[PDB]
Amino acid sequence: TLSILVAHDLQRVIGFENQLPWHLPNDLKHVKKLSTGHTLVMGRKTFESIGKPLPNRRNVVLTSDTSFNVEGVDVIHSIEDIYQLPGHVFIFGGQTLFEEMIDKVDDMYITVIEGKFRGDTFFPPYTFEDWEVASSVEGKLDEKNTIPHTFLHLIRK
Ligand SMILES: COc1cc(Cc2cnc(N)nc2N)cc(OC)c1OC
Numbered sequence: 001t002l003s004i005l006v007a008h009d010l011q012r013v014i015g016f017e018n019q020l021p022w023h024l025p026n027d028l029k030h031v032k033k034l035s036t037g038h039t040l041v042m043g044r045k046t047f048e049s050i051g052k053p054l055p056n057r058r059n060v061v062l063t064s065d066t067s068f069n070v071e072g073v074d075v076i077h078s079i080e081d082i083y084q085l086p087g088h089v090f091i092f093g094g095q096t097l098f099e100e101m102i103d104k105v106d107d108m109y110i111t112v113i114e115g116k117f118r119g120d121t122f123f124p125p126y127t128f129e130d131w132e133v134a135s136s137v138e139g140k141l142d143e144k145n146t147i148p149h150t151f152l153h154l155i156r157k
Helices: 026-033 042-052 079-084 095-101
Strands: 002-009 014-015 039-043 057-063 072-074 089-094 105-112 133-138 148-155
Touching: 002 026, 002 095, 014 095, 026 089, 026 105, 026 148, 039 042, 042 057, 042 133, 057 079, 079 095, 089 095
Parallel strands: 002 089, 002 105, 039 057, 039 089, 057 072
Antiparallel strands: 002 014, 105 148, 133 148
């Protein structure tokens, strides 16, 4: 199964100055729950943002730089390489990988950040004519998670 995994805001912002503009440990816990024991595929910029591979899952970096290597990370150089990865594979970003994969994936796990933040990188537009909401769950708020957010699982219509 090939899935997108993304957190974006009401204007599809997915980053500002190479970071998430919101701080939502609850979203990071969502990511842990979905992807632990599976595979994340991400662009080099997203990898350099997380700094180190996320534990307890396969971390795959897609980059055109054949000189790129990191202990604990598998590196690929083509989109085609993704289709040969075993198991459940989550496309983890960033913008250009999302743009390349949105028409190709089976489903999407989206955290909608229910606010409008500063942004300089964006998830591609999508329509609920192409996507069906399989589940929608409001995120819980606490002192460390202060922005309303909604967890969606979308499948093709
Ligand atoms: C684990 O940390 C980060 C994760 C992400 C990607 C990401 C984060 N959340 C969700 N739901 N999907 C994603 N693809 C992006 C980040 O920065 C841009 C991160 O830095 C904290």
